[PDB]
Ligand binder design. Structure first.
Ligand code: HEM
Ligand code: HEM
Lengths: 362, 362
């Protein structure tokens, strides 16, 4: 139920304990007026400080002038903050606007085409994103809906994705959640307590080349459909061999406990864990923060199921790209398809009550 | 933590409203009555396991390596989470298996209502399973595994995820708010009101269809909200649509949510005034719906609304008269019914030897 502090050197919703629910929206910018966009960033930041404390935006949800629309849409009245975090990111396409071309970080790389990609252009890209995570889905929807309303005329929602349940962990002391393939997902991540690893692998440093990004991060989002029909007819041995961990405990093959260290040479050469492990990728390490989704049926008599994969890293070129390139031969490829993609530069934190989202860029 | 599966009635109607919903409609692909009976029995055995927080069949792991696991494993480590699974039979089922003369008269086809825009792909269905639980992964796991068990005899026609309150953060005697920001459920049948359930919800032997005694009839309507239109309405316009104020949810001219309405103080086409039993010859419903938010549509608008579920003793004397009276509802400006289905929900599973549909099939 508790609030997560909004202010800091970093944005919340990265290193923060992973909340149960996601509402992710990508927006395109429709104004060419730099001042109007800056004004929106400040208004959004004011709104975020209310939302993340469990207060209504503006003058509230009722008790205003009868003849005016309420400032807050009202559907979160009476609810707790529910660990709401709101994390903003800027897409490569933003930097074609407002005279920003030379401020595009080098670490904000366009992804190459990967084998098996089938990206829907409508559900890819975006000038900016707001990741809303909370333990209560209504708290999350309310936040996105109110930001979008505030931004009417200046931004439009390009695409959105709801995540019903987490498939990631930044808290190794708590139970690791399972994805819809039935495997624990997040055992070997970066914990929010591992300050050293976060500095090394997640946060952008001044020396990395883009001063406005110091204390920020870079985000890859991949919408991945799961072929659950195909998977569910696979044997238990096939499923475990795909990953290199057992299904029940989620231990590395041959070992007894989830958190025992993998012995990679005992795994199949195309096992997912073997291919994705930092030791297989010159040390490349990622903060995974994904969620599961289901968007109805596929119209062929089956449930639609997927994973909305979210990875944070210090540089896309040294994080997600080398790892996913190594997954070219992954056994898991038989059971998944990447159907949406976007990258974002996640700026530094809102330092105090006088700061605002994007202040270091603008 | 768990809701008993067995009883004179199915759970998931009069039992406490859980925080999450996964509702699936299925179509039957077999013509063999024996094969369908066999499926109902296997489903009933699976439901008994699922609602006690156990895996289906021989489990999710620890079987024969070369066999697919019986349970897909994504609920391992979760609690039962007050899961209830409620089955219903659509009118189209009765054209199979020689059941045409056992269709209840109370299982009426709905008339076309003014402003209906029903998507045929997200309407109807031979049968439904309503899975309610506090943890949406428990609900999804249930649906996924029933669908798997039934593969070859049934397919999933459509499905819907929903949310109500989050019980860990929100007191249970608090009325939830719908996505228009109004309290929703203040004047409803409560599962404590045994005599009102007998009068208005449960089918009786004398009603004309003996196999349905202790069952009920379900109407499902997928009702989209025009969120962005609504949010531009004045507070006075919003309150005038309902006949209650937004902050407290009191009837106009009254002070508290639970004060009894004075219908003449409301506008003639206010929703509460039109839907109230006194405006409908005493017709009263048990509402048990959930909010949804599915994502954003092609225009950048929020695909959100109310997955409305009503239980009643007879569709002709419950939903039909009430929805007919909403022809002129002030709310119609802001909503559209886009999917519909009706089901006969049979009596409960009496004990460990009984099975879903036993009173119909023998
Ligand atoms: C539907 C898609 C995927 C599924 C089901 C999945 C599943 C898993 C599972 C079960 C683990 C083992 C437990 C763990 O340490 O988290 C794992 C580990 C991992 N995955 Fe994936 N994953 C998927 C996609 C991806 C993608 C797209 C990437 C990166 C490009 C990735 C990178 C990793 C990494 C880095 C690990 C940890 C390896 C280690 O250090 O031991 N995964 N995944
Ligand atoms: C999106 C669609 C709808 C919304 C947002 C909505 C909202 C509300 C709200 C705010 C109330 C007042 C509080 C309470 O629950 O008592 C209400 C009452 C009610 N609604 Fe609706 N409703 C919708 C659709 C329907 C439909 C389709 C029916 C039935 C056909 C219906 C039947 C009722 C009834 C029977 C009451 C209680 C009236 C009374 O006895 O005081 N509603 N609804």
């Amino acid at each position: 139920g508790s609030a997560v502090p909004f202010h800091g050197a970093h944005q919340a919703g990265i290193a923060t304990p992973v909340q149960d629910r996601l509402h992710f929206a990508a927006f395109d910018v429709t104004t060419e007026d730099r001042a109007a966009f800056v004004a929106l960033l400040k208004e959004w930041t004011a709104a975020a400080r209310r939302l993340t404390a469990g207060h209504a935006v503006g003058e509230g949800a009722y008790g205003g002038l009868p003849e005016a629309p309420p400032d807050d849409t009202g559907e979160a009245l009476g609810l707790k903050p529910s660990r709401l975090t709101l994390t903003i990111g800027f897409g490569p396409s933003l930097f074609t606007r407002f005279g920003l071309a030379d401020l595009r970080p080098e670490a904000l790389a366009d992804l190459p085409k990967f084998p098996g990609d089938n990206l829907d252009r409508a559900r890819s890209g975006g000038d900016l994103c707001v990741q809303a995570c909370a333990d209560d889905p209504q708290v999350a929807v309310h936040a996105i809906r109110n930001l979008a309303r505030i931004g009417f005329g200046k931004v439009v929602v390009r695409w959105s994705q709801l995540g019903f349940g987490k498939t990631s962990s930044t808290t190794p002391d708590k139970q690791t959640p399972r994805n819809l393939l039935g495997f624990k997902d997040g055992t070997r991540n970066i914990a929010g307590t591992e300050k050293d690893r976060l500095d090394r692998f997640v946060w952008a440093a001044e020396k990395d080349g883009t001063p406005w990004m110091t204390g920020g991060s870079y985000l890859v989002a991949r919408r991945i459909r799961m072929h659950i029909e195909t998977w569910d007819r696979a044997s238990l041995q096939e499923q475990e061999d795909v990953f290199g961990r057992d299904k029940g405990e989620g231990a590395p093959v041959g070992k007894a406990k989830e958190r025992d260290e993998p012995f990679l040479k005992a795994m199949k050469p195309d096992a997912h864990v073997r291919l994705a492990h930092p030791d297989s990728n010159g040390g490349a390490t990622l903060l995974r923060r994904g969620y599961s989704f289901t968007d109805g049926t596929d119209g062929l008599g089956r449930l639609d199921a997927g994973l909305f994969f979210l990875a944070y890293q210090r540089d896309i070129r040294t994080g997600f790209v080398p790892v996913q390139r190594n997954l070219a031969t992954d056994a898991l490829n038989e059971f998944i398809q990447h159907v949406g993609s976007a990258v974002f530069a996640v700026p530094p934190g809102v330092r105090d009550a006088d700061d605002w989202w994007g202040s270091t860029l603008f």
